[PDB]
Scaffold this active site. Structure first.
Site, short mmCIF file in Angstrom:
data_model
loop_
_atom_site.label_atom_id
_atom_site.label_comp_id
_atom_site.label_asym_id
_atom_site.label_seq_id
_atom_site.Cartn_x
_atom_site.Cartn_y
_atom_site.Cartn_z
N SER A 1 32.98 33.60 32.95
CA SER A 1 32.00 32.53 33.22
C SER A 1 30.77 33.08 33.96
O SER A 1 30.16 34.03 33.47
CB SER A 1 32.68 31.37 33.95
OG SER A 1 31.89 30.18 33.94
N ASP B 1 34.83 24.65 24.40
CA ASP B 1 34.61 24.94 25.82
C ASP B 1 33.61 23.94 26.31
O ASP B 1 32.50 23.87 25.79
CB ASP B 1 34.07 26.38 26.00
CG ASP B 1 33.89 26.83 27.45
OD1 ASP B 1 33.41 26.03 28.28
OD2 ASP B 1 34.14 28.01 27.74
N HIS C 1 37.68 26.50 29.28
CA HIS C 1 36.73 27.39 29.95
C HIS C 1 37.40 28.57 30.65
O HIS C 1 36.74 29.56 30.95
CB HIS C 1 35.90 26.57 30.95
CG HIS C 1 34.70 27.31 31.45
ND1 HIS C 1 33.61 27.54 30.64
CD2 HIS C 1 34.48 27.88 32.66
CE1 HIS C 1 32.74 28.22 31.38
NE2 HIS C 1 33.23 28.45 32.60
#
Length: 271
Positions: free
Chosen positions: A98, A220, A249
């Protein structure tokens, strides 16, 4: 020093495994190095593995959270570089989850000599939709998210965790992520959330010189599939995309059986 009190202590640095090559694992917003639990056992026999927590994670000292340093992603990139220099690592494979994917990109722009490759999971150079750009969010969506954090941090964590993790809302991965989210100091979670959500790394992508492997779940909440294509087209380096048939995610934590083999292929093989 150029980039930085013990760096290893502040970031809960753990160095494990053995081998010629070093893998450094950088986690995303709201989680910590525990996100890599299913990956690490597949790496330790072949590589030295470095795990660390981002300043601002619930496992870090809130008194060390420097609001000026972390007002942009570059502050986190300098902490990553300081960790590599502290350990005398001259080259690593960096796996960024991320926000850590962009942190890794920025660190490679400042220090390309320190990275042989970047493996990105759930990466995005910009979350907010722009004229000719699909990020997945309108400013109004972020405004609602920040209002929810201001109003009731605990309720926001409980509502957000199953949405970010995806899949079954009562899974162990949802419970772990609700726990690490709620471990953050609420004001730090809001400050960091805003810094990340309002970031825009698009302009610097053509200047990246380290090869990038772009991995994401097909479904996601924070990363439309189109973002992986946008990254591949705009990164100036050699890159490859792999969209995984997974939801969530934090897929390395929630669907390890299907996700771990994909991450492993991109770590073990070069473009």
């Amino acid at each position: 020093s150029l980039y930085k009190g013990v760096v290893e202590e502040a970031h809960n640095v753990k160095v494990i495994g053995s081998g010629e090559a070093t893998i450094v694992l950088g986690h995303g917003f709201g989680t910590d190095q525990s996100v890599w639990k299913h990956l690490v056992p597949h790496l330790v026999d072949d590589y030295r593995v470095v795990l660390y927590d981002n300043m601002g994670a619930g496992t870090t000292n809130p008194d060390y959270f420097d609001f000026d340093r972390y007002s942009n992603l570059e502050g986190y990139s300098f902490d990553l570089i300081a960790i590599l220099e502290d350990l005398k690592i001259e080259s690593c494979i960096f796996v960024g989850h991320s926000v850590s994917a962009m942190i890794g990109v920025l660190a490679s722009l400042n220090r390309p000599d320190l990275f042989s490759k970047i493996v990105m999971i759930s990466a995005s150079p910009r979350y907010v939709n722009d004229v000719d750009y699909q990020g997945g969010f309108e400013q109004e969506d972020l405004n609602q998210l920040f209002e929810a954090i201001r109003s009731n941090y605990k309720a926001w964590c409980l509502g957000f965790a199953p949405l970010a993790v995806g899949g079954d809302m009562d899974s162990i991965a949802v419970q772990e992520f609700s726990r690490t989210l709620f471990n953050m100091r609420p004001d730090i979670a809001l400050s960091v959330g805003q810094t990340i959500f309002q970031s825009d790394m698009r302009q610097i992508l053509p200047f990246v010189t380290v090869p990038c492997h772009i991995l994401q779940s097909v479904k996601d909440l924070a990363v439309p599939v189109v973002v992986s294509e946008y990254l591949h087209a705009n990164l100036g380096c050699e890159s490859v995309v792999e969209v995984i048939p997974s939801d969530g995610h934090l897929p390395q934590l929630s669907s390890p059986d299907s996700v771990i083999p994909v991450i492993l292929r991109h770590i073990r093989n070069d473009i």
